[PDB]
Amino acid sequence: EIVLTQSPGTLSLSPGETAIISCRTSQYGSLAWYQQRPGQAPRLVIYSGSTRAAGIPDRFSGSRWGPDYNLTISNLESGDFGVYYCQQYEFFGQGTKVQVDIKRTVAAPSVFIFPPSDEQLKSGTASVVCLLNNFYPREAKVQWKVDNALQSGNSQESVTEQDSKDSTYSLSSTLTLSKADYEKHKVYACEVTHQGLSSPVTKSFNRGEC
């Protein structure tokens, strides 16, 4: 039984700057760090505590002091961003997510709302789609309103990655209702709350308008 405590879980960094991940092991043993690029098989980075693995840039350096282990990455290349797990014997740690975040000027979203197509309604369901498009930074809040009734649970956000061209995020929340529920209420609104907007922008459409 090994109790591996890994921190800090989430890391948002721009390419270049240093990224320090760390674990804390109960028992004493040889510890390794693994890299999982998203969509690939994990990669052995460090083993035996700080011994760099085979074909790993000198930019990866592990340090150990007592029960605390670090993993220090410097000059974050494009391919380094992923998730890193520390291992001691057969046990791993919670892990940490190393996300790339290109810093830039705070833009704003282009909220667009799409009612459910008449074909979808004929099929029996209805799916309304709000679209916060090309904004920065990531953190944004979409609140679905229906007849001035706050909706939590029905929505389902989904965000794209850092747009390599302009370093901006896009988002599309999909609220789903049954045709019965859809045909019951009227004004369907999507409230956005990003810091780029001075105040929440409430793009909405009244059912049966154009």
Partner 1 sequence: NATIMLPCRPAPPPHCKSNITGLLLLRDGGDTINNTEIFRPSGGDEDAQWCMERLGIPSSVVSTQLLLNGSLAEEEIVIRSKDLSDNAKTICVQLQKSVEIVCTGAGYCQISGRNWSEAVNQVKKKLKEHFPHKNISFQSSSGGDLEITTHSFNCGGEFFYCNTSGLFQD
Partner 2 sequence: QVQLVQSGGQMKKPGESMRISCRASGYEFIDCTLNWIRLAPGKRPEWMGWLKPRGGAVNYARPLQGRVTMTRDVYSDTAFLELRSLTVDDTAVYFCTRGKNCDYNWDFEHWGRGTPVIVSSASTKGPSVFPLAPSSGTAALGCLVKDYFPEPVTVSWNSGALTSGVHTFPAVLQSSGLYSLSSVVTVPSSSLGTQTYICNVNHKPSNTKVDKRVEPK
Ligand X SMILES: *[C@@H]1O[C@H](CO)[C@@H](O[C@@H]2O[C@H](CO)[C@@H](O[C@@H]3O[C@H](CO)[C@@H](O)[C@H](O)[C@@H]3O)[C@H](O)[C@H]2NC(C)=O)[C@H](O)[C@H]1NC(C)=O
Q: Which residues bind ligand X (CB under 6 A)?
A: 20, 22, 63, 65, 68, 70
Q: Which residues bind partner 1 (CB under 8 A)?
A: 1-2, 27, 29, 89-90
153: left (phi > 0), else alpha (psi -120 to 50), else beta?
Answer: left
- The entry of ligand X, Cl ion, Na ion, none near residue 120 (CB within 5 to 8 angstroms by kind) is none
Which residue, 90 or 119, is less far from partner 1 as judged by CB? Answer: 90
Q: Which residues bind Cl ion (CB under 5 A)?
A: 158, 160, 163, 174
Residue 1 C-beta: closest distance to partner 1, Å: 6
Distances (CA, A) of 61 to 7, 13, 38, 71: 17, 18, 22, 6
Which residue, 1 or 118, is less far from partner 1 as judged by CB? Answer: 1
- The entry of partner 1, ligand X, Na ion, none near residue 181 (CB within 5 to 8 angstroms by kind) is Na ion
Residue 16 C-beta: closest distance to partner 2, Å: 27
Residue 7 C-beta: closest distance to partner 1, Å: 21
Long-range contacts of 75-82 (CB under 8 A, 24+ apart): 75/16, 76/13, 76/14, 76/15, 76/16, 76/17, 76/18, 76/19, 76/100, 77/15, 78/15, 79/37, 80/19, 80/35, 82/35, 82/36, 82/37, 82/38
